[PDB]
Design a protein around this nucleic acid. Structure first.
Ligand SMILES: [Mg+2]
Ligand SMILES: [Mg+2]
Ligand SMILES: [Mg+2]
Ligand SMILES: [Mg+2]
Ligand SMILES: [Mg+2]
Ligand SMILES: [Mg+2]
Ligand SMILES: [Mg+2]
Ligand SMILES: [Mg+2]
Ligand SMILES: [Mg+2]
Ligand SMILES: [Mg+2]
Ligand SMILES: [Mg+2]
Ligand SMILES: [Mg+2]
Ligand SMILES: [Mg+2]
Ligand SMILES: [Mg+2]
Ligand SMILES: [Mg+2]
Ligand SMILES: [Mg+2]
Ligand SMILES: [Mg+2]
Ligand SMILES: [Mg+2]
Ligand SMILES: [Mg+2]
Ligand SMILES: [Mg+2]
Ligand SMILES: [Mg+2]
Ligand SMILES: [Mg+2]
Ligand SMILES: [Mg+2]
Ligand SMILES: [Mg+2]
Ligand SMILES: [Mg+2]
Ligand SMILES: [Mg+2]
Ligand SMILES: [Mg+2]
Ligand SMILES: [Mg+2]
Ligand SMILES: [Mg+2]
Ligand SMILES: [Mg+2]
Ligand SMILES: [Mg+2]
Ligand SMILES: [Mg+2]
Ligand SMILES: [Mg+2]
Ligand SMILES: [Mg+2]
Ligand SMILES: [Mg+2]
Ligand SMILES: [Mg+2]
Lengths: 63, 203, 58, 144
RNA sequence: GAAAGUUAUAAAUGAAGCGGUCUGGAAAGGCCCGCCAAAGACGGUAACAGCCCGGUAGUUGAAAUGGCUUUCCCUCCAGAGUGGAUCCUGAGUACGGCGGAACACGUGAAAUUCCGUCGGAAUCCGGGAGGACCAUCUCCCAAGGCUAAAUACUCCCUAGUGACCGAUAGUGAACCAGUACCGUGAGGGAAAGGUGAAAAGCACCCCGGAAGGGGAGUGAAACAGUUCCUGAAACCGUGUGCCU
RNA sequence: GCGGAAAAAGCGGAGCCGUAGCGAAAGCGAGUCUGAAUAGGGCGCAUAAGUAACAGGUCGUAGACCCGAAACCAGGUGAUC
RNA sequence: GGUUCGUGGUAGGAGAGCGUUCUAAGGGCGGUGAAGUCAGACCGGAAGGACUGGUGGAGCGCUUAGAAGUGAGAAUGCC
């Protein structure tokens, strides 16, 4: 049978042109009194999946 | 190349299309296609019984501890004499096709090989009034075959198939039915002018 | 144990807790023993309240 | 048929483990010693991290999918040079020739490349640059 | 209901070498000559056979029964147009609440479908659906029923096939096997194939109560002797070259 | 799928992958998103190769390298002890 | 073809091979004795391979490719 996509991941990662995965940052709901405005500006941007993580998860989101 | 009659006499010469019979043979492609065609003939009807499929074997043969025997789960576990087979054959298809373009190159290349080897005899006619194996055998002497030979014919000529049916190395086929493995299985390729037209019409 | 008019009878399904634990239960029809005459002669038969609603013998 | 040689490098002998120590894959058969990964059927599921919360759960879900998302078949100018000068390029002509096979939601013309010929291009959409470029050559764009 | 055709269930006919010679127990094998072939399938026959046998291709064949296909019989049968006064067009139904279920869809914003329970329409100026819901538009007309084919499976039958097994394999079962045997019972569940081409299966003599032997005979072989092709290893012995 | 010999071709372009990306999305497009920005920055382009088939390696779903529990559930059989 | 530096090794990675059954094609062996089996002081770097002779009494190699139920000394393994 066909491999199944990991749906949790398909709702969180996006594949870039070069074939990398782009993601959002964690600490970005609530508890915003506890984070600095600089932290907030940084956490608001997207990020790439690290090489180590990518090795672990790439089959989960092929397709 | 030359164009001889059933009797064996020369009838001028025919000009084979160089895009079908002239091309530089691609041996590597012909080998791939031969292997695929041999694989596709397999029936693959082979099975064994795994430990689930073998009769009986439901109960634990003796208690896990205390008897001084090796622990065993079923009398049909695979290390038991009449037990299940661990992997072993399962019914499966071995068939696969290379891409169409590679399959066309393969037939073009095997046919070009036969011309290079001077193993292709083009006949004006080939017909028999009645099914007569003696006549077909005499024909093969006149053409000077004395080997396995694939005979390709178009102008229906039902009497050709019957007349060559009992000869051991000889195969008669339509023209629509020419295949890499049938050309490879046979030394000489004898083809009627009418059949050459039909083969070039496709390639 | 079945409505003679309709065919209403017990059917199975789930009881569900908060927490959504499921366990099998039934739904019985609201069958009542009543005298009617389906065939000419009267007789005491199970009939659903729903079947009685409106026009039946009694 | 008695002298078949498959292309060199096209076929390789499969590796068979558990067939003695000489091979280098005998006994433990490449699995090393014990633990979950030595066992038949052994190994954790794909993104599993041994109980550390997996990456995908550390990060938030984002966005939605539009039920009415339009995706256009893209045609860069360069391929329009294929056509003869003073020719009327339609979608039907762009699929016959074999430039766009499936015309998803429509045909959009994009600038990428440079056009030489003076055409009359009709498509569902044009990039501002594409329109300018088709015209700069000496053509007319129509939006069907 | 007939009739005709055809298929099935028995069969019939069917080409060509006793060819020479070599080895051999035997020739189908070797060597050298022929021949048939719409037949060079398969099997058998004293070793490997197109031409020895059963057959095979091809061509024929059915008293009886069954199937199928046609034709006949027999049986059955109204279908267009024009209006729109009125009438009809599936009710405890649709739907709703409550509780469940089915929907890929876990009650969710939850359409659609079903069950229990309670409530309960409209009914052509009518009704349903288009994923809460309303409006518009579009497409449909529920609460009655029937319907072949394309699909699933094989205890069977017929004909075949296999880079499937070859007796610890392949069915549990090649052999009187669901037997023997075990179990109160449900149930569990084995082992076990091979003389030779042919019985020509060892007359007769000898030792022995017999078993079993030794001769003699058969046979190509008996160190093929009624479980009898081959006959490994463990293991058991006899003899003795070197050592103790 | 049709055709056929459990063929070979031929037919079959529906579909799939690639040829453009960026954005949650509307969308725009060699750019795009963010942003008041003609700024900077992210991902892309400028530094085109893919696709079909077979073979090797590894992974996923399947018992998934083999043997082994104690247990659990379902239908039966037992009070000749 | 030389030169230089190398060549202990468990888990483990990489490579090249041996042998087994089956298939195809080619080419062979075999009642003047096939496979199997027994023996030997032979050959190859290894896996392994021949030769000769006994037994055996009818099938079997080789070459190139292909496919795998493809290699056992251990499982208190099963018979
Ligand atoms: Mg928030
Ligand atoms: Mg079982
Ligand atoms: Mg002990
Ligand atoms: Mg077995
Ligand atoms: Mg290897
Ligand atoms: Mg190692
Ligand atoms: Mg070991
Ligand atoms: Mg270990
Ligand atoms: Mg480990
Ligand atoms: Mg924790
Ligand atoms: Mg005869
Ligand atoms: Mg003689
Ligand atoms: Mg014999
Ligand atoms: Mg014989
Ligand atoms: Mg409900
Ligand atoms: Mg559900
Ligand atoms: Mg609605
Ligand atoms: Mg209700
Ligand atoms: Mg509704
Ligand atoms: Mg809607
Ligand atoms: Mg929806
Ligand atoms: Mg209606
Ligand atoms: Mg058996
Ligand atoms: Mg045996
Ligand atoms: Mg058995
Ligand atoms: Mg005996
Ligand atoms: Mg319990
Ligand atoms: Mg009882
Ligand atoms: Mg008593
Ligand atoms: Mg050293
Ligand atoms: Mg080393
Ligand atoms: Mg390796
Ligand atoms: Mg053998
Ligand atoms: Mg032996
Ligand atoms: Mg094995
Ligand atoms: Mg042992």
């Amino acid at each position: 049978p066909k491999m199944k996509t990991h749906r949790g991941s398909a709702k969180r990662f996006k594949r870039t042109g070069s074939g990398k995965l782009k993601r959002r940052h964690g600490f970005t709901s609530h508890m915003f009194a506890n984070k600095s405005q600089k932290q907030k500006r940084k956490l608001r941007k997207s990020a790439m999946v690290s090489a180590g993580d990518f090795k672990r998860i790439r089959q989960m989101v092929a397709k | 190349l030359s164009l001889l009659k059933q009797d064996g006499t020369n009838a001028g010469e025919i000009t084979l299309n160089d895009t079908v019979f002239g091309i530089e043979p691609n041996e590597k492609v012909v080998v791939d296609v031969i292997l695929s065609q041999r694989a596709s003939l397999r029936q693959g009807t082979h099975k064994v019984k795994n430990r689930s499929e073998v009769r009986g074997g439901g109960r634990k043969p003796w208690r896990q501890k205390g008897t001084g025997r090796a622990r065993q789960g079923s009398i049909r576990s695979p290390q038991w004499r009449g037990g299940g087979v661990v992997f072993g054959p399962t019914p499966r298809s071995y068939a696969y096709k290379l891409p169409k373009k590679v399959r066309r190159l393969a037939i073009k290349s095997i046919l070009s090989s036969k011309v290079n080897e001077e193993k292709l005899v083009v006949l004006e006619g080939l017909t028999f009034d009645a099914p007569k194996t003696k006549e077909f055998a005499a024909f093969l002497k006149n053409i000077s075959v004395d080997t396995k030979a694939l005979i390709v014919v178009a102008g229906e000529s039902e009497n050709v198939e019957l007349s060559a049916r009992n000869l051991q190395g000889i195969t008669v086929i339509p023209a629509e039915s020419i295949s890499v493995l049938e050309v490879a299985k046979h030394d000489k390729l004898i083809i009627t002018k009418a059949a050459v037209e039909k083969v070039e019409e496709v390639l | 144990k079945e409505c003679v008019i309709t065919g209403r009878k017990s059917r199975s399904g789930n009881k569900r807790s908060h927490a959504m634990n499921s366990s099998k239960r039934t739904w019985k029809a609201n069958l009542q023993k009543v005298r009617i005459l389906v065939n000419g002669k009267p007789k005491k038969v199970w009939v659903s309240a729903r079947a009685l609603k409106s026009g039946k013998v009694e | 048929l008695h002298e078949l040689k498959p292309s060199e490098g096209s076929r390789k002998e499969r590796n068979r483990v558990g067939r003695g120590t000489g091979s280098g894959n005998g006994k433990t058969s490449g699995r090393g010693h014990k633990g979950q990964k030595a066992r038949s059927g052994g190994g954790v599921r794909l993104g599993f991290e041994g109980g550390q919360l997996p990456l995908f759960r550390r990060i938030p879900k984002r966005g939605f999918t539009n039920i009415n998302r339009k995706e256009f078949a893209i045609v860069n100018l360069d391929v329009l040079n294929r056509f003869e000068d003073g020719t009327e390029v339609t979608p039907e002509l762009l699929v016959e020739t074999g430039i766009i096979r499936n015309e998803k939601s429509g045909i959009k013309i994009l600038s990428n490349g440079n056009i030489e010929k003076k055409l009359t291009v009709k498509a569902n959409k044009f990039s501002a640059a594409a329109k300018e470029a088709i015209e700069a050559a000496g053509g007319k764009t129509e939006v069907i």
